[PDB]
Amino acid sequence: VPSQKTYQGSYGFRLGFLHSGTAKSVTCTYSPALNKMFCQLAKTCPVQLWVDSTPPPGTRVRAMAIYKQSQHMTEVVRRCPHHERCDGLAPPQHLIRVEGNLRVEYLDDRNTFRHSVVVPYEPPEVGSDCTTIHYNYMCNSSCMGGMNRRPILTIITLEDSSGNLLGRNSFEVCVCACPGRDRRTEEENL
Amino acid sequence: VPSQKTYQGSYGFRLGFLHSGTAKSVTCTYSPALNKMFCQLAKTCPVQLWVDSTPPPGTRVRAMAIYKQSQHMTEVVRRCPHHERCSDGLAPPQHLIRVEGNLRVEYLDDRNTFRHSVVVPYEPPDCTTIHYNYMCNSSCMGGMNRRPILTIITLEDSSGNLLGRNSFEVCVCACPGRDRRTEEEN
Amino acid sequence: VPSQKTYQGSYGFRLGFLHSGTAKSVTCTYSPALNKMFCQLAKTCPVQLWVDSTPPPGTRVRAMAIYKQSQHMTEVVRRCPHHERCSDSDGLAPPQHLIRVEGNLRVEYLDDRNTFRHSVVVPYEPPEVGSDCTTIHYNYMCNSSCMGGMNRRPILTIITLEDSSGNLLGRNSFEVCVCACPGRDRRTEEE
Amino acid sequence: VPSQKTYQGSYGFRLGFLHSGTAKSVTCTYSPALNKMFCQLAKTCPVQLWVDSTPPPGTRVRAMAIYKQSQHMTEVVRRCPHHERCDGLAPPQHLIRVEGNLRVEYLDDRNTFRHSVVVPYEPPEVGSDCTTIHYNYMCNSSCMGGMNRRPILTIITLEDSSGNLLGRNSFEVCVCACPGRDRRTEEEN
Ligand SMILES: *C[C@@H]1C(=O)C2CCN1CC2
Ligand SMILES: *C[C@@H]1C(=O)C2CCN1CC2
Ligand SMILES: *C[C@@H]1C(=O)C2CCN1CC2
Ligand SMILES: *C[C@@H]1C(=O)C2CCN1CC2
Ligand SMILES: *C[C@H]1C(=O)C2CCN1CC2
Ligand SMILES: *C[C@H]1C(=O)C2CCN1CC2
Ligand SMILES: *C[C@H]1C(=O)C2CCN1CC2
Ligand SMILES: *C[C@H]1C(=O)C2CCN1CC2
Ligand SMILES: *C[C@H]1C(=O)C2CCN1CC2
Ligand SMILES: *C[C@H]1C(=O)C2CCN1CC2
Ligand SMILES: [Zn+2]
Ligand SMILES: [Zn+2]
Ligand SMILES: [Zn+2]
Ligand SMILES: [Zn+2]
16 A cells, blocks of 8 residues: 655655635635545645745656555545546546646556556745645545545655655545535534 | 624624733733733633523634724734744644634635634533634734734624624733733823 | 774864854754754855874875664665756765765765765865864755655764875764754754 | 943843852852952853843843953954863853853854854743843953953843844953952942
8 A cells, every 4th residue: 555654855845725714615625633625526626735945846746545444445546437437638537636737647557556646846936835736536425436435545745757755745535515514514523 | 804893793792801900920811991902922812702692503703803003904914924933733824813722723714805714613601711812922023013903703603694793902912911001001 | 884983093183063053044053962963955064173283194084974873874874866866066976975075176985895885085184374173064965854865864974084095093973964944953952 | 343232122131140249258249339240260150131021932142242442342252272272062262151051052153253152041930030040251351362351241132033132231240269359349449
């Protein structure tokens, strides 16, 4: 199973998320207490990259989903049969897409059969302190043919142009209709 | 500029404050005559919620800081760059107002106004108390820089409908007891 | 494992370091309490050599890094795969070597044929006109936190004074952190 | 030339000193009339920090010596060659050390070449009203090749974690064999 161990590494790599709140109209919202992103099917899911020093051009950022529970960790996370039968760049089986990036790259691992999506690292824009990638999750947590309500973790890895690992972080993910209500409910139960 | 007007609304919503006095040891103290809270950096600032009838479960209580002077009211109130680099794991580093001791605390960066606020669930008690922390001094250059602020406390239902609103002024300074006594002399 | 045992030897060989303090912007700074240098990736790290009597011409000054923890001491300290990738600023130095010397055209780098350890050596030069010490500017080419390299493990640098034929004359050592803000890391560690 | 202007600042920074008197046995004694400390070489010289409100954690306290006389003020105060010979954590050239503090930090200023010593500000223990720092002076005022009978001032500055001035005070210092007699004799004039 792919490592999920957090490493800030040489560049001080960590993730951040918008402080979106839990209003009914929010389409994605992150829970710091749960380290868990709540988002809507195929909607924009901003993840921020925070670094202490700037990685060189050529650095790449990879995202991969794995099942959190130990008895499902060896199963490849993929879309359900229904949603797979629905882009011109992403493989129809992949749960995680990146939108708004024409240099996006998709991988089916030839040995593990796991799916991942990678984009070029770009430094923050002029007035910004973080790089933002817009992920899309293409299947509901409740899709019976896929995750089937099993919790998943998204692993974000920073790697150089030769594939050497530079840092790693991760967050749990829920894909459901009303992420504001779901966040509020799950924090009530803790 | 977000609305600052007082409204007790349907539930008779008001704010209360402990009668802590101005002895040297006080870590925070409220002046009724100035409707002003004097507190210390990152120390407990208790605010009581008074209601004539209980809001339904799912009610929420929001706090937001705004500059009091009309020439500064459109500037977002945020921590100075020094303190923003100076976390509880839950709060954004730029936010002036935190809530301590509440694991269901939620923080908002408004996508369009860019203003900061902190919201907790309303819990029934004879008063509901929220422990706020103010994370930047009134005197911080680059932050409030000696400009007066108001904290706006809003009661909202679970759908975000406004139920009531109150407010108070706040000082964040090293000796709240001495500051209150001095300003009330003028 | 090469020796880290301090020995002033017959020339009274000692190390000195600038008294730089811990301001946030300082580029390197040494902690006497920790016998530890805090420096930045690829930036100047001055180390002073102090001798009681002047070593003969042909004397050489070697620097080598070793891991401090016993379960890693037989591992060669080297740059991580990421940083060991060749660059156009490598110059006179092997791309795998953690420790460089800057501003010295007579610098020499060694991959030991038998132990595979890396080291960098320069001629010993006596202090200039109105000076009491000789300064060498080292650069450390990999952060302490580099994945696939030091990977947060602590290291020592061993400075040896050698004769023209390589016999040990003197030896000292110090620990090294390579991090983004040495002033902060030192002030925080001394708490 | 560093500032010696007294500056109580926002925290109400003041110095205090023990009321030690001038008996023969005393090793450090302060003259209020002269604002001048009389202490022996390398012995404990206590200096109290008094504040009206507690400065934040991360505050630091710096000490630096300058020559009191205007015609010597640009000369760096340092130890004489005799005493400078190589001790613990301190640089051998530094006149002013701090005793009993593992977090002490010493600075040779890269631009002014001045020496100084810095420790973290600690608040007074609950019950106590002031913070004491134990300084040591490592050269006699009479040392040939060092101070050479020239009077010096010790400047104590309060700074925040980024080095910004919060407060400043100063006092004269005389390092000599018998501080009690020296103080008593100097107050006769
Ligand atoms: C992290 C960055 C910033 O500095 C602000 C908030 C979110 N992104 C874009 C603007
Ligand atoms: C040891 C030498 C000197 O005599 C001064 C201080 C540090 N180095 C360079 C100049
Ligand atoms: C700077 C180094 C490191 O990276 C860890 C923590 C402190 N030192 C020793 C090990
Ligand atoms: C240091 C003292 C003085 O002030 C003078 C000269 C030497 N001792 C005795 C008298
Ligand atoms: C997203 C949500 C679900 O639907 C189950 C897995 C994780 N989280 C809790 C239960
Ligand atoms: C808290 C105190 C200050 O520091 C200024 C703004 C508000 N109040 C009066 C002056
Ligand atoms: C980059 C690579 C080369 O091409 C030679 C010089 C340094 N490195 C090893 C050999
Ligand atoms: C310590 C670190 C910082 O935070 C900036 C100034 C100096 N150094 C590089 C960037
Ligand atoms: C602050 C000062 C005093 O007044 C006594 C107690 C502690 N310190 C030394 C003596
Ligand atoms: C210590 C004594 C001296 O030797 C001169 C300077 C200060 N004090 C008075 C004169
Ligand atoms: Zn599906
Ligand atoms: Zn501030
Ligand atoms: Zn590296
Ligand atoms: Zn002397």
